[PDB]
Structure formats: structure tokens, C-alpha cells
């Protein structure tokens, strides 16, 4: 996260760390949506241009963390994956369209002050909240600069009009993405960055005071460049595949 701040303790209890067994490294962010299901970006697991293709046993999810590098004894839980599910039409060849995957944990996690799932949006929270100018919140342990934080970082960013997103890039933007970030003249900065992928873009409902995950940190060009924006998987547009996977398996 670039131009963010240190998270408060307990601030994002749904934030999950995707962790490589060996070499032991931070792969990506991810989010806890129930006691057994983690949501992340497909490109964290599967990205052939970079010879990235992880499987279940390659991987550990660490939940409840605040410190990037510490093993947080008595606070964090570390779980093994039972099954990764990538969207069947995830488009790694061209534009990272449908950049989304579900991971089933081998056993359920118990909730605590530091570990609690986020809501997925319904049609109407989506319609009401996903609007240009409205701010959401991104979190992660990724690079601070296009160097890495000791502690979870947080930044709040406004949703950007769809045409402005399209005109900022050569990349073909689809209906399954939105972009967020400050314009060059607005005079505030901030962006996700390398290592933040797969993490939650969340908004607080002003109707029921719950936090909803609207986006997954997907891709950008550099980090925090003026006139560039971060792009996110549109979780609501892909909710049907989420429901399907979850209650088939």
C-alpha cells in the first residue's frame, strides 16, 4: 500500500495473508468470508506469464495478523488449504478479467477479536454504494513504494468514473472490474501495490453499519502514478459463481 497508514489492531479482522511455505514468503492478501472460505485474486495462484502456478500444498493462509513478519503467538491462526477454485473464465492471457479464486480451508477457523468474516454484497448494497466519488478501503502488507511495512497498512480511496478508468489505460477494461484512486489534481494520493493483490476493497454500509467487500485488489500500472488507477475485481458481478462454488462444494 502506498501513501497509507498503519492499521489499528482489529481494524480489518477479515484480512488474510497468503503465505508461501518455502521460501517462506508473503504471496498475496486475501479475505475471510466465512469460517471455512477465503477469497483472493486468481492471479495470486495462477499466472503463467510469470510461471506462477501454486497448488494447495504450496500454501498456508495466516489469519488474524497485524505484523507482517512476526509469528504472532496466541493471536494468529495458520491454516492449510483443502481446495483452490479459480474462475473457469479467468483471463490471464489478456486483461485479468474475472481475477477471482476461492480457497476452502481444511478445517474451520474460530473467530476472535482479531478474526471475523466480512460480508459479501447483495444486489442492492452494490447498486447503492458502488458509485463514483464514494470511498472504499484497501489493506495489505505489500510494498510502500513502486520498502515493506512492519505492520498492516490501510488506505481509503474514491471509486472513479468508468470512462476516466478506460481513458487512463491501453488495457481493455471489462464490466467485471472497477477502478479506484485519486485524480492528479485532487491532491491526495494512495494505491495498492505489489504484494497487496487479492486483498479486500471494502465499504461500510450506512444502512446497517456492516462492512461489505466490493472489490479484490487486482492490477495497476506501477503504484500510485499520477493519472493511473488501481483496478479491482467486481465481487458483486461474480457473486453467482461464488454462491455456486460454495454450495456445490
Amino acid at each position: 500500500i502506498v501513501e497509507g497508514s498503519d492499521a489499528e489492531i482489529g481494524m480489518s479482522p477479515w484480512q488474510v495473508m497468503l503465505f508461501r511455505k518455502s521460501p517462506q514468503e508473503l504471496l498475496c492478501g486475501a479475505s475471510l468470508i466465512s469460517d471455512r472460505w477465503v477469497l483472493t485474486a486468481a492471479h495470486c495462484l495462477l499466472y503463467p506469464p510469470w510461471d506462477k502456478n501454486f497448488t494447495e500444498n504450496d500454501l498456508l493462509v495466516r489469519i488474524g495478523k497485524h505484523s507482517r513478519t512476526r509469528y504472532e503467538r496466541n493471536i494468529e491462526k495458520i491454516s492449510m488449504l483443502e481446495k483452490i477454485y479459480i474462475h473457469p473464465r479467468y483471463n490471464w492471457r489478456e486483461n485479468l478479467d474475472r481475477d477471482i479464486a476461492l480457497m476452502k480451508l481444511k478445517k474451520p477457523v474460530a473467530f476472535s477479536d482479531y478474526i471475523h468474516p466480512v460480508c459479501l454484497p447483495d444486489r442492492e448494497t452494490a447498486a447503492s454504494l458502488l458509485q463514483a466519488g464514494y470511498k472504499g478501503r484497501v489493506t495489505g502488507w505489500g510494498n510502500l513504494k513502486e520498502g515493506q511495512p512492519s505492520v498492516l497498512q490501510v488506505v481509503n480511496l474514491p471509486i472513479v468514473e468508468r470512462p476516466v478508468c478506460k481513458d487512463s489505460t491501453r488495457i481493455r477494461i471489462t464490466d467485471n472490474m472497477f477502478c479506484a484512486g485519486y485524480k492528479p489534481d485532487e491532491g491526495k494520493r494512495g494505491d495498492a501495490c505489489e504484494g497487496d493483490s487479492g486483498g479486500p476493497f471494502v465499504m461500510k454500509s450506512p444502512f446497517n453499519n456492516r462492512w461489505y467487500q466490493m472489490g479484490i485488489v487486482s492490477w495497476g500500472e506501477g503504484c500510485d502514478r499520477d493519472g493511473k488507477y488501481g483496478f479491482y475485481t467486481h465481487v458483486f458481478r461474480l457473486k453467482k459463481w461464488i454462491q455456486k462454488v460454495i454450495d456445490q462444494f
Binding site: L120, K135, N156, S205, N209
Partner: peptide, 26 residues
């Protein structure tokens, strides 16, 4: 069904340090 409510904030009726910026933008 308890989703989206943070033990250390919403459940205690405490606000985090920047969530007002979120709510003010809506």
C-alpha cells in the same frame, strides 16, 4: 450472519480512526 461487524469496534460502538471519511463520502 455476524459478518462485517468488528469485535473491537462496531460491537463496542467504537469507531476507527478514518471510517468517518468513508461515511462522509456517501
Amino acid at each position: 450472519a455476524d459478518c462485517g461487524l468488528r469485535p473491537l469496534f462496531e460491537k463496542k460502538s467504537l469507531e476507527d480512526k478514518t471510517e468517518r471519511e468513508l461515511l462522509e463520502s456517501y
